[PDB]
Design a protein around this ligand. Structure first.
Ligand SMILES: O=C(O)[C@@H]1Cc2c(O)c(O)c3c(c2N1)[C@H](C(=O)O)C[C@H](C(=O)O)N3
Ligand SMILES: O=C(O)[C@@H]1Cc2c(O)c(O)c3c(c2N1)[C@H](C(=O)O)C[C@H](C(=O)O)N3
Lengths: 238, 238
């Protein structure tokens, strides 16, 4: 609970300290990168993570819509080009889907997206729509915290995904530099740390939803049906 | 998947059929009303449900803000008076909190609210903000689907809560009558069923979050800390 404004370097350290709560520490993530995850768990992960990825560009556009500074927009738009392509990351993820046995329609349809994942992700969007652009922009800085096994995974799609993700052009540090410039009072600094925590909560909550469904055999409505019964529509956009 | 517009009576039956997915069928809810719930589970439930309750009036006001029909507003505002009082339901829930051993500050602070609960609830609000008023209004119709044991529970607060909830004046059927009037095409009807499913998903997801935290010993960041580390702020409103 910051009492006296921290310096920019010290603030950066505090922000980086929040990485301790990054989602790589979630048992579900651990199990996937341990090879202890089942195939159900893997396909679930890709389908659900895809929703996040298709939301990012909407989230970034929301930020731009709220940002009257042309130079900031000139940088921010590169995030949208990265995701949308013109291949792009959405496309790269479609290839990973294929590699793990899911069709493009399976993914594009968003039919497999668990409501807990949806709500967590949409929270990110709705923050970006409503928050001052600086705050929303800064929340992107968690990207700084970043099979075989699984023989059944198609090498070619994989490498394809891994590879497309590697040509992104956005300035991943932008959020950080902004936060250090913008958060120049104790009050802003504490609030920024809480915004970071919000973002970390989104990522952890996505994984909790996946844990319940694919690892604990407790998907939505499991006591009442064996079919997927959850809503599958971005109701206010579609 | 409605192909030919249903009649109003048949549509009502379809809507009521969605009650099969109501949250009373969630293992967490079952355990509470079975007396199989632990005290941790109960206090968690009250603290987390409280967030829903404090959001309802915001949700209802959002609907009104989107509703240029004065007569509709004249009815809808009664929902806000019910919750806000002037005692009201928010107050009634504060008394139940007391009955189960939680202080007013504990509840009002929203500090115990799990992020999964928060995201699910905020989804409701953000739907209400953005959707046409008719759609948002109709989603309220799930209210139509509606300790000892637990000796440690204070009878007086309880009865107090149970009792205040019983003097609400809103027209719980309003959403239904609107849906029957408004949803006069196959397309609107299918969409309304999907909106209902959305609402049901919110309620189930709230309970999943509670299940993970209080029943499966898997609250957020459990692999990294034993303290509550999640964000506790309505960032865009506070
Ligand atoms: O908020 C944002 O705009 C960024 C955009 C983004 C990505 O493109 C990821 O692939 C991506 C993240 C983000 N966040 C995630 C993030 O930290 O938010 C990390 C996650 C991962 O692979 O672990 N991948
Ligand atoms: O969407 C809405 O406006 C209504 C308002 C409301 C309440 O006041 C509840 O107590 C309340 C609900 C709702 N929904 C819940 C709902 O069905 O949405 C049910 C739940 C229960 O006690 O089981 N309690």
């Amino acid at each position: 609970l910051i009492t006296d404004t921290l310096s920019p370097q010290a603030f950066e350290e505090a922000l980086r300290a929040k990485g301790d709560f990054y989602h790589i520490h979630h048992p579900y993530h651990i199990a996937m990168h341990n090879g202890n995850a089942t195939r159900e768990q893997i396909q679930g992960w890709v389908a659900n993570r895809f929703y996040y990825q298709t939301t990012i560009p909407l989230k970034d556009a929301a930020i731009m819509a709220n940002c009257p500074d042309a130079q900031t927009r000139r940088k921010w738009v590169q995030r949208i080009l990265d995701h949308d392509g013109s291949d792009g990351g959405i496309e790269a993820w479609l290839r990973l889907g294929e590699a793990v046995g899911l069709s493009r329609d399976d993914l594009l349809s968003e039919r497999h997206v668990l409501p807990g994942v949806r709500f967590a992700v949409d929270a990110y969007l709705n923050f970006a729509r409503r928050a001052c652009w600086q705050e929303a922009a800064c929340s992107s800085l968690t990207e700084l915290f970043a099979p075989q096994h699984y023989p059944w995974i198609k090498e070619e799609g994989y490498f394809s995904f891994r590879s497309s993700l590697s040509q992104a052009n956005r300035d991943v540090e932008h959020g950080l530099a902004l936060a250090k410039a913008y958060c120049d009072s104790a009050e802003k600094q504490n609030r920024m740390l809480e915004i970071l925590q919000f973002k970390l909560d989104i990522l952890w909550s996505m994984l909790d939803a996946m844990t319940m469904a694919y690892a604990l055999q407790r998907p939505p409505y499991h006591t009442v049906t064996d079919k997927a019964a959850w809503h599958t529509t971005r109701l206010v956009l579609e």
